[PDB]
Amino acid sequence: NAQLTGLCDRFRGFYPVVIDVETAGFNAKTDALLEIAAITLKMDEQGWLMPDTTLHFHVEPFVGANLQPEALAFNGIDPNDPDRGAVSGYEALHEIFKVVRKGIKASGCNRAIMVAHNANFDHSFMMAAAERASLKRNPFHPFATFDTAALAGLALGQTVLSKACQTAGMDFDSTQAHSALYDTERTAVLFCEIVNRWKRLGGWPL
Amino acid sequence: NAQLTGLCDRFRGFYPVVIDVETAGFNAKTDALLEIAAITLKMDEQGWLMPDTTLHFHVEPFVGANLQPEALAFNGIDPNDPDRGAVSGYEALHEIFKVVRKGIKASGCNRAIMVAHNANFDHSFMMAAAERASLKRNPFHPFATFDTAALAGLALGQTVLSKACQTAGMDFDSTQAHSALYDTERTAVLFCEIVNRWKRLGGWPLS
Numbered sequence: 001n002a003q004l005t006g007l008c009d010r011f012r013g014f015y016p017v018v019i020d021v022e023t024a025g026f027n028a029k030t031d032a033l034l035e036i037a038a039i040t041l042k043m044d045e046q047g048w049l050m051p052d053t054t055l056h057f058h059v060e061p062f063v064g065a066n067l068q069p070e071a072l073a074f075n076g077i078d079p080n081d082p083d084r085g086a087v088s089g090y091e092a093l094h095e096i097f098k099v100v101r102k103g104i105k106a107s108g109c110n111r112a113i114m115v116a117h118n119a120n121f122d123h124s125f126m127m128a129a130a131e132r133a134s135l136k137r138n139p140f141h142p143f144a145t146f147d148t149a150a151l152a153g154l155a156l157g158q159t160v161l162s163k164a165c166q167t168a169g170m171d172f173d174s175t176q177a178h179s180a181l182y183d184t185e186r187t188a189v190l191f192c193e194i195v196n197r198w199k200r201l202g203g204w205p206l
Numbered sequence: 207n208a209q210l211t212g213l214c215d216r217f218r219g220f221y222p223v224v225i226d227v228e229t230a231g232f233n234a235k236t237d238a239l240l241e242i243a244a245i246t247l248k249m250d251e252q253g254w255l256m257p258d259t260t261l262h263f264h265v266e267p268f269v270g271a272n273l274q275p276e277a278l279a280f281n282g283i284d285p286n287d288p289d290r291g292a293v294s295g296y297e298a299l300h301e302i303f304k305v306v307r308k309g310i311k312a313s314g315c316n317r318a319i320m321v322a323h324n325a326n327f328d329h330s331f332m333m334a335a336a337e338r339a340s341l342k343r344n345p346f347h348p349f350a351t352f353d354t355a356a357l358a359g360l361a362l363g364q365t366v367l368s369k370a371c372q373t374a375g376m377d378f379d380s381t382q383a384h385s386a387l388y389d390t391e392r393t394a395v396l397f398c399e400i401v402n403r404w405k406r407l408g409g410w411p412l413s
């Protein structure tokens with residue numbers, strides 16, 4: 001309870017959850033959601049941020065979903081592979097929201113906020129997936145996000161995930177990139193580093 | 207040329223332009239754009255960031271636009287008021303793009319990136335107006351932004367514009383808030399401060 005409360009209090013009630021999504025295109029309303037990974041965070045007693053929990057689902061292209069081959073070629077996902085283990089968008093988000101809503105309960109926490117690289121992209125797909133599924137209990141703030149591309153611009157002078165991670169002194173494997181799980185991992189680590197670094201430099205507290 | 211490359215160099219080529227819009231609702235696709243202000247930035251010889259150029263346009267509701275009274279009640283704008291001096295969305299954007307493209311011409315810069323509080327909101331309306339007007343040659347990055355709500359969250363632990371500005375040491379006047387000019391202005395000063403504060407604590411340069 002404490003470490004989830006100290007986390008939220010760091011962001012005025014916001015409970016930051018790192019999200020990465022794979023898709024069949026750039027249109028959140030018409031292109032398929034194909035993969036989603038979520039990483040929750042926590043604050044240790046010293047006030048340092050770090051990764052807590054990890055969820056990950058492959059998602060079945062919804063009925064009516066367009067699919068751009070350039071997208072599939074990019075992330076390498078085959079929506080047809082049987083051993084894929086894809087579930088519905090509903091199932092994926094419901095399970096993630098369930099884990100998040102619990103976080104928000106143990107609260108100085110009020111609402112969840114999405115952390116993502118170029119968060120506008122991942123946010124819109126999540127909101128669209130939730131839309132199709134008619135999920136009423138959505139714990140994420142409907143418009144606000146923590147975009148690590150902007151935070152990296154500030155702290156690192158880099159907006160590209162790989163280059164930002166490298167520049168931050170992080171390991172980065174191009175061969176593992178563009179996978180929901182790896183990308184979310186790197187992004188959560190990058191996010192935690194930027195915040196902590198700000199702390200180490202005496203930028204925080206105020 | 208110097209101040210623009212330095213600036214751009216700080217963000218790997220990105221030429222940051224602060225933007226604030228006023229609208230007739232929350233749907234960028236279907237609700238009216240009513241107002242837009244833009245503030246360019248510059249870096250002095252000491253490496254500090256500050257506001258440079260400012261332009262501002264009231265915008266006439268495009269044909270077919272919806273207007274939410276709650277939106278109008280919120281911002282105080284009357285789209286019928288004859289002395290607004292409202293221009294087309296094409297005109298406001300064209301004028302703003304012209305000034306921005308002039309900045310990108312600097313050797314260091316190669317693309318503009320929008321700075322805004324909850325930037326996804328402003329960015330979507332900007333991109334939709336540009337789309338309505340069939341504007342090629344849009345100098346702003348098509349999907350990237352610098353969101354001051356996120357940067358204030360990190361730097362100050364505040365995400366709300368007024369709260370962040372107050373918490374930052376800046377004056378904020380709720381009287382003048384929710385207007386394009388004022389909001390863009392507070393937002394630009396807040397962005398510059400967060401960047402500068404970062405520099406002053408030794409987070410930048412990386413050396």
Ligand SMILES: [Co+2]
Nearest residue numbers: 033062089129
């Ligand atoms: Co779906």
Ligand SMILES: [Co+2]
Nearest residue numbers: 239268295335
């Ligand atoms: Co327009």
Ligand SMILES: [Mg+2]
Nearest residue numbers: 020021117183
């Ligand atoms: Mg991504």
Ligand SMILES: [Mg+2]
Nearest residue numbers: 178179180183
């Ligand atoms: Mg990815």
Ligand SMILES: [Mg+2]
Nearest residue numbers: 226227323389
């Ligand atoms: Mg605004």
Ligand SMILES: [Mg+2]
Nearest residue numbers: 384385386389
């Ligand atoms: Mg405003």
